[PDB]
Amino acid sequence: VNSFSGYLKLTDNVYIKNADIVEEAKKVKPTVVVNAANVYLKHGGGVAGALNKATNNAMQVESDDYIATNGPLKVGGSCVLSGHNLAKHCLHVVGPNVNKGEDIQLLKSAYENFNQHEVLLAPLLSAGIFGADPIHSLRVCVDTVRTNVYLAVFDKNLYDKLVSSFLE
Numbered sequence: 597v598n599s600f601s602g603y604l605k606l607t608d609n610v611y612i613k614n615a616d617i618v619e620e621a622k623k624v625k626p627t628v629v630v631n632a633a634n635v636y637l638k639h640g641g642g643v644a645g646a647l648n649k650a651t652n653n654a655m656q657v658e659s660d661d662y663i664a665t666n667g668p669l670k671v672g673g674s675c676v677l678s679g680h681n682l683a684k685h686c687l688h689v690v691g692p693n694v695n696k697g698e699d700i701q702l703l704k705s706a707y708e709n710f711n712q713h714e715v716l717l718a719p720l721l722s723a724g725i726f727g728a729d730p731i732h733s734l735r736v737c738v739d740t741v742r743t744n745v746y747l748a749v750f751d752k753n754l755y756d757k758l759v760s761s762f763l764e
């Protein structure tokens with residue numbers, strides 16, 4: 597149903613909220629929820645762990661079947677699979693892990709995948725243990741994504757930092 601509420605409008609197509617992406621998916625019933633994935637779709641930590649646990653492991657079982665038959669994703673790439681109980685579809689997107697020296701230019705490739713979907717619920721890419729500067733990740737989203745993206749950032753201090761920087 598895509599019923600998003602409580603978001604700040606940053607640009608004509610980019611919105612942000614201090615919220616847990618799992619609770620937003622349960623409330624909003626989005627067509628697409630984005631997962632902050634890794635190349636072998638191992639959903640143990642970060643946003644991926646939160647989304648997988650909220651599907652009671654159904655996302656990991658489906659992801660393992662996909663990897664067995666198709667192999668790993670590329671950094672910057674993506675894959676649409678079921679959204680299970682959280683959304684119609686899950687778009688698994690791999691941003692670069694700059695803590696491991698992956699190419700930060702591939703963060704633009706990662707966000708470019710969102711342009712195939714009219715509206716998405718998403719986390720900020722390459723944050724957490726991937727180590728990209730979060731203000732830079734929001735700027736790449738704003739400059740690359742043309743479709744409607746609703747960003748859920750589940751940390752008040754990071755949300756306030758992002759909003760303050762954007763409004764400068």
Ligand SMILES: CCNC(=O)c1cc2c(N[C@H](c3ccnc(N)c3)C(C)C)ncnc2[nH]1
Nearest residue numbers: 616617632642643646720722723724750751
């Ligand atoms: C209680 C169950 N829910 C959660 O644990 C949870 C976590 C969470 C989240 N985390 C962000 C993140 C972590 C890793 N990689 C990223 N690309 C981003 C950080 C930057 C705040 N962002 C959005 N919603 C979220 N929900």
